[PDB]
């Protein structure tokens, strides 16, 4: 506030309160594996070269 002179209305005390909110954003990406890769990772490292 600023002090005022004669004849002028004085400024009153003022209190202000506010709130800020956040946003949402999901991201996604798919990937797939062949069944052959699944069985190779599943079972034994054996057989022909």
């Amino acid at each position: 506030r600023v002090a005022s002179g004669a004849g002028l209305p004085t400024s009153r005390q003022t209190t202000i309160m506010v709130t800020k909110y956040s946003e949402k954003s999901p991201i996604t990406i798919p990937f797939e594996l062949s069944a052959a890769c699944l069985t190779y990772l599943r079972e034994t490292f054996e057989g022909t070269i």
Binding site: G5, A6, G7, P9, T10, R12
Partner: protein
Amino acid sequence: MAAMEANIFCTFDHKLSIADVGKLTKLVAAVVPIPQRLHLIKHYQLGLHQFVDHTRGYVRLRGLLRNMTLTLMRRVEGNQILLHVPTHGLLYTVLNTGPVTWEKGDALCVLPPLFHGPLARENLLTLGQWELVLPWIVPMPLALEINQRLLIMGLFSLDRSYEEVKAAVQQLQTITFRDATFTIPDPVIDQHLLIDMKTACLSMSMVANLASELTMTYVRKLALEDSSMLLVKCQELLMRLPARPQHVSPDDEIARLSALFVMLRQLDDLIREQVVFTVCDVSPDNKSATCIFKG
């Protein structure tokens, strides 16, 4: 919001000589009116001078003063003035600014000044063609006389010849009260007095309509068997014109008087002035008194 201030500081932006400040110091405990309430105000708004106008009417100035708020002056400093707003029912010391003599126990009213004597009292703070004009504080009978004179002049002005209107205004404007003589300045007849004249005419019409035959005949019947200076001076005003009352009905009389009281109050209000102070003390030089504030 901002609560109304009780203490008001006034500062003159005009430069003050030592004589001006000396004059200000004498005015402590006097009543000064202001148009608006602030913690710090300029001297222009102080006093009755701001309303002095080419219209010059006493009635409009009386109307304006009624709406201003009254303050008492607390002690003075250099270039500053402190004013205090009184509260109803408390006890205060007040200064008799005007020439009117006060008495113990009477009621005081605030009223625009009316000139008296040589008319050379106007030394009050003339600076930059602004002047410290203060209202008068007067006891109730003088205010009633002033208002009554104004209203009678207004009513008489109707349909009377111009020259005899001048003569009536000349004889009515002067007042002798409590061994002093005063005269009303600028008794102009205009709309402000016209509205009061209208209300007075209405109230008188209703009073004449309501009054019972018993009330009308009381004076006429009394003169047949009483005799006194009061009565003979009383009956001189009336137009010159055994038995039993033609109609007796106390309930009708009661109701009729009940309404007639309301009409009489309506007529009374336009000459009544609100009591601002009631005094019970006096300085034996009449310069100051202690009063209870009301209104």
